[PDB]
Ligand binder design. Structure first.
Ligand SMILES: Cc1cc2nc3c(=O)[nH]c(=O)nc-3n(C[C@H](O)[C@H](O)[C@H](O)COP(=O)(O)OP(=O)(O)OC[C@H]3O[C@@H](n4cnc5c(N)ncnc54)[C@H](O)[C@@H]3O)c2cc1C
Ligand SMILES: [Cl-]
Lengths: 514, 519
C-alpha cells in the first residue's frame, strides 16, 4: 500500500552514512539507498566529538569496538584545553563530572583556577590517560570516566561506507541535477545529471550546506546565528607532533578567531576558524603559520552559522549541514547529526497516510541547536585574552540574549552546579543538554566572569585530600600512545567498556537512552 | 545578609491574606528567619474563598518546606485524602479514573485497555478509587499503611486552612497589618517606593509580594505588566458553589462531572461534599447553572457565585515586586494546579530573593520558568475540553470544534501514531516529555486521551498477557481489602507515627531523603 518501504539518503558524508546505518539497524525491513556524487566531495572536516557519540556508534549502530579501532585508529578526547580568556595558562574543560568530581570551588580557592576540579582535568594537564600498567597486564579506568574520540575523517567515512555495504544499504553513484516536486510539500523524484530519475518513499537531505531538498527545493528559509557567532571560514592544515598525543582537543585564541588542534596518530590536524570580515584568508593562513611553525596549508572552507526554520517538511528531513551548522568550538556537529538521526528513526511513519510528526521534530531540533548557539555565544563574549579589533568587537557586541537570564543567576552565586537543588534544577533548563550546567560554569569560571563565589560548605583540608588522591592517580596514568597500543593488543578492554553494568558506556546506561 | 549593608533587603511586605499570601509569608520566615516579614490585608476585600484540592507535591511542601507538624495540621485542618480524580467524562458510560501513583502503583496501561476496555486497572490507586477504599489495613495489633509507597494529596476546607495558616504565621513572628491599599506608589522605573492606604498610612518595605488576587494591584495595575488570556483554549469564567451531604462516606478522590455548559467538582470534607459548577457564562445564566446543579446533585445548597479568568501575566517578577497566586495567573481547577503553582512561585521567590539591592536580579529566569510551567498546564487542560464526547449540548459541540490545542498538537500527532506515549521507546518518551506538564507528565496526558477514547494505534504489550493479569489480580486483592477512608483517617488521628513514617522513612515517596533532593 502506502507503506513507507524505501528511503533515499541523498549525500554521503558522515551525515549520510550515519543516517543510512541507523535506518538499516533499527528498521531493517526498509530498503535504504545512499546516493552520492563521486565528483562533488564531502565537506571534509568534523573530527572531534563528545562522549555520547561513543555510545551512539557502539550501542545504537552496533559498531564493534575492536574493528572500529583497527580501521579508524581513533585517539581519545578527555575534554578541551582552552588557551582562552585572560588567565595566562588558560583552563581545561573535561568530560567527567560525577564519578571524576574532586570539586570546583576547592579548585578555585586552592589554586585560583578550575584545573583541579576533576580527575580528567588533572589527567589533561599531565598529558596522561587513566590507563595503568598493573603487573598482571593493563588496568583501565576509562570505563568510569566518560571520554570521546578524535577520528580522521577520511578513515571514519571509509569504514562507515564498508559497514553500510555489509548491512545491505544500496549505493547509487549519481549527481542530482534537479529535485522535482509533485505537490506542495512533496518531492516526487530526483533527476540526475546523466538523466536517471530516482524515486523513494522518503528522502533524507544530507547534501551539505547547499541543502538541495530542504532549502532549495522546498524553500525552507535559513535563520542566521550571526548576531552571536561572527566567524565564517577556516584554513586547515596538519602539524607533526613527534608521536606525542595530547589526550584532548585544543582551542587557541587567535587574532580574528580561534584555532583547533585535534590529534590523530599520524599528526595534529589544525583549523583556524576566523571572520572574513576581520581578515583576508591569506593573512589568516600567514598568522596560522606564524603561530604554529611547520604547519601545512591545505584548504580554505567557508561556512555559515545558523539553522533552517524546519528540518522536516513533508517527505524530506535534513540531517547535517543541510539543516544547521556552528563552528566546532564544542564539537557538537556529530552530536547533532546523531540527535537528528535518532529523531528520524524513532518518528518515521509506517505509512504515507499516517499522522506526520514533523512539528515535533522541528521543535526538538530548533531547541537543541538554539541552546548550543547561546552556549557558544558566551565563549566569545567573555574572552579577555587578546585586544585585537575582532576580540574587542566580540566582547562588546556578541548577542548573548538567550542565555542572559542564566548569566544573572550565575552572577548572584557561582558555580551554578553548587547551588541548592531547586535553583540548580531551574537553571538546568537554560543549559545545553549534554554540555550541562557544568559546561556553562567551566566556561564562565575559566574566563573569570565576575560572580559571587559560593561558600565551600565543607572544610579546606578535605577537598585537599580528595585533590591528592586524584593528582596521584593522574600522574601515574600512562601516556596516550602506550595506552592506545594496549587497547589494540587487548580487544577485551573495549568490550568491558560496552558490556559492564558499572561502565559509563555500559549496556545498562545505553538502554536508558538508546 | 550583612550587618553593615545599608543596601540589604531586610523587610518584606506580603500584600494579601488568602492562601497565596500566608504560604508566602510562612515560607519567607521559615527559610530566611532574619527577615522582617509583614502581611497586609484588607478586612473589606474578602479572599476568593474556594481552592480545596491539591496534588501530591503539596503534601511535601506543607510539611517539609514549611515545617508544619502533621498531627497539628490534621487536628486543625481536618483533611481528607485524594488518590486522584474521577472523571465522569468522555463517551464511556462509567467514565475513568486518574490516579497519582504511576510508578510504584503501576499495573500497566496497555494491559488494562486490552483486558478491560478502559484505564481503570492501570494502577493500584486506580483500583482503590473504583472500590472507594484506601491503602490502609488493620494489621495484627495495629494498622499497616501503604500510603508511604503511593503518592496522594489532600482535600482541605478553605476556611479551616486559612485560619490555621493565619495562626501559624502569628506564632512564628509574621507581623500583621490591617489595611486597604489605595495606591501603589512607584519611585522609579520598576521600583515600588511605597503603599498608601485608603485612610492615609504609608507602608514601605524593601521588597513586595503581590498576593492581591485577580485585581493584581502591584504587578498589573502599578507596574503595567500585561495579561495573556488563555481564552482560545479555556472558555469557562464562573462557578456556582454549594455543599451536599454524604452520610459520612468520604470518597478518596475529587470528582469531575461533565455538565451542560462546563463541569462540576466534588471535593469531600469530613462534614460534607463541597461542589462547584464551573461554567461559561456566555452559554448559561448563573441562576440556570444553579438550577442544573440542583437537578444533577439533588439537595445541594447554593452558596456563592465566583468569577474568574484564565491566563497569565507576561511576567511574575519585576524589580522589587513578585506576584504569587491569582495576581499572576489562574486556570480552572480541573487538575488542581492552583496551590501547586503558588508553591512553585514561593520556592522561586525564596530561593532567588536577593540579599541586597546591589546583588544581580534573577527576575528573567523566574519569569521564563513560570511562563513555561503555566503554558504547559494550559495545553494539558485544553485536551480535557477538545475531546470530551459525553454530551451533545451547544457548549460541548463548540468545545469539541473550537478549543485551541495548538501548543500540544505536535504531541497529539505522536500519540495517534502509537499510544500510550508512556509505552514508547525511551528516546521518543524523552522528546514527548518536553510538551507535557512537569508535575502531571506524559502519564497524565496518556490517561486523559485514552480515557476520552481519542483514536490511536494502540501499542502491542511488552509482556505476555498472563503476567499483566497476575499483577492485576495481586493489586485487585489489595484494593478490595483497603479500609474505607473514614476509618483510616481515624487511625491517622489516633497514631501520629503513621504520618511520621510518611515524612521520615527513606522508602517513602514523601520522605526526608526525597525532600532533600526536591529541595
Ligand atoms: C472557582 C475556583 C476554584 C478553585 N479551585 C482550586 C483547587 O481545587 N485547588 C487549588 O489548588 N486551587 C484552586 N483555585 C485557586 C486557589 O483558589 C487560590 O486560593 C485562590 O484562587 C487564589 O488565592 P489568592 O491568595 O491569590 O487570592 P485571594 O484569595 O483572592 O486573596 C487576595 C487577598 O488580597 C487582598 N487584597 C486585595 N486587594 C487589596 C488591597 N487593595 N489592599 C489590601 N489587600 C488587598 C484581599 O483582602 C485578600 O486577603 C481555585 C480558584 C477558583 C476561582
Ligand atoms: Cl486549581
Amino acid at each position: 500500500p502506502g507503506a513507507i518501504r524505501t528511503v533515499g539518503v541523498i549525500g554521503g558524508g558522515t551525515a549520510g552514512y550515519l543516517t543510512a546505518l541507523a535506518l538499516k539497524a533499527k528498521r531493517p525491513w526498509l530498503d535504504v539507498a545512499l546516493v552520492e556524487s563521486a565528483d562533488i566531495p564531502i565537506i571534509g572536516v568534523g573530527e572531534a566529538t563528545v562522549s555520547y557519540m561513543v555510545m551512539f556508534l557502539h550501542h545504537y549502530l552496533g559498531i564493534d569496538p575492536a574493528e572500529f579501532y583497527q580501521h579508524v585508529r581513533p585517539t581519545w578526547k578527555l575534554g578541551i584545553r582552552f588557551e582562552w580568556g585572560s588567565r595566562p595558562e588558560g583552563f581545561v574543560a573535561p568530560f567527567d563530572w560525577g564519578t571524576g568530581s574532586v570539586g570546583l570551588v576547592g579548585s578555585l580557592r586552592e589554586t585560583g583556577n578550575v584545573n583541579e576540579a576533576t580527575l580528567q582535568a588533572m589527567l589533561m594537564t599531565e598529558d596522561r590517560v587513566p590507563v595503568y600498567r598493573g603487573e598482571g597486564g593493563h588496568v583501565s579506568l576509562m570505563k568510569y570516566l566518560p571520554f570521546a574520540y578524535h577520528m580522521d575523517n577520511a578513515r571514519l567515512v571509509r569504514y562507515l561506507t564498508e559497514l553500510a555495504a555489509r548491512r545491505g544499504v544500496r549505493h547509487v553513484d549519481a549527481t542530482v541535477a534537479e529535485v522535482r516536486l509533485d505537490g506542495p510539500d512533496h518531492v516526487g523524484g530526483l533527476i540526475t545529471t546523466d538523466g536517471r530519475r530516482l524515486h523513494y518513499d522518503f528522502y533524507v537531505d544530507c547534501t551539505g550546506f547547499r541543502s538541495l531538498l530542504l532549502e532549495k527545493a522546498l524553500g525552507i528559509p535559513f535563520e542566521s546565528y550571526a548576531s552571536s557567532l561572527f566567524t565564517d571560514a577556516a584554513v586547515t592544515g596538519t602539524l607533526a607532533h613527534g608521536g606525542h598525543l595530547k589526550p584532548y582537543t585544543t582551542a587557541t585564541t587567535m587574532n580574528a578567531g580561534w584555532c583547533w588542534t585535534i590529534p590523530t596518530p599520524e599528526s595534529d590536524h589544525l583549523g583556524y576558524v576566523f571572520s572574513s570580515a576581520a581578515i583576508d584568508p591569506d593573512d589568516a593562513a600567514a598568522e596560522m603559520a606564524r603561530r604554529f611553525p611547520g604547519v601545512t596549508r591545505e584548504a580554505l572552507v567557508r561556512f555559515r552559522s545558523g539553522r533552517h526554520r524546519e528540518a522536516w517538511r513533508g517527505n524530506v528531513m535534513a540531517v547535517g549541514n543541510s539543516y544547521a551548522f556552528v563552528e566546532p568550538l564544542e564539537s557538537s556537529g556529530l552530536l547533532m547529526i546523531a540527535t537528528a538521526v535518532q529523531i528520524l528513526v524513532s518518528l518515521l511513519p509506517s505509512s504515507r497516510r499516517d499522522p506526520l510528526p514533523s512539528d515535533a521534530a522541528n521543535q526538538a531540533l530548533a531547541h537543541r541547536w538554539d541552546a548550543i548557539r547561546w552556549f557558544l555565544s558566551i565563549h566569545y563574549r567573555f574572552n579577555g585574552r587578546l585586544d585585537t579589533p575582532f576580540w574587542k568587537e566580540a566582547r562588546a557586541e556578541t548577542d548573548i540574549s538567550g542565555i542572559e537570564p542564566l548569566l544573572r543567576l550565575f552572577a548572584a552565586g557561582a558555580p551554578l552546579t553548587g547551588r541548592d537543588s531547586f535553583t540548580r534544577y531551574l537553571a538546568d533548563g537554560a543549559a545545553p543538554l549534554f554540555y550541562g550546567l557544568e559546561g556553562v560554569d567551566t566556561l564562565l569560571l575559566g574566563q573569570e566572569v565576575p560572580a559571587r563565589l559560593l561558600p565551600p560548605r565543607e572544610p579546606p583540608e578535605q577537598w585537599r585530600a580528595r585533590a591528592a588522591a586524584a593528582r596521584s592517580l593522574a600522574s601515574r596514568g600512562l601516556r596516550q600512545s602506550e595506552a592506545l597500543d594496549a587497547y589494540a593488543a587487548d580487544p577485551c578492554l573495549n568490550a568491558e567498556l560496552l558490556s559492564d553494568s558499572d561502565s559509563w558506556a555500559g549496556e545498562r546506561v545505553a538502554v536508558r537512552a538508546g
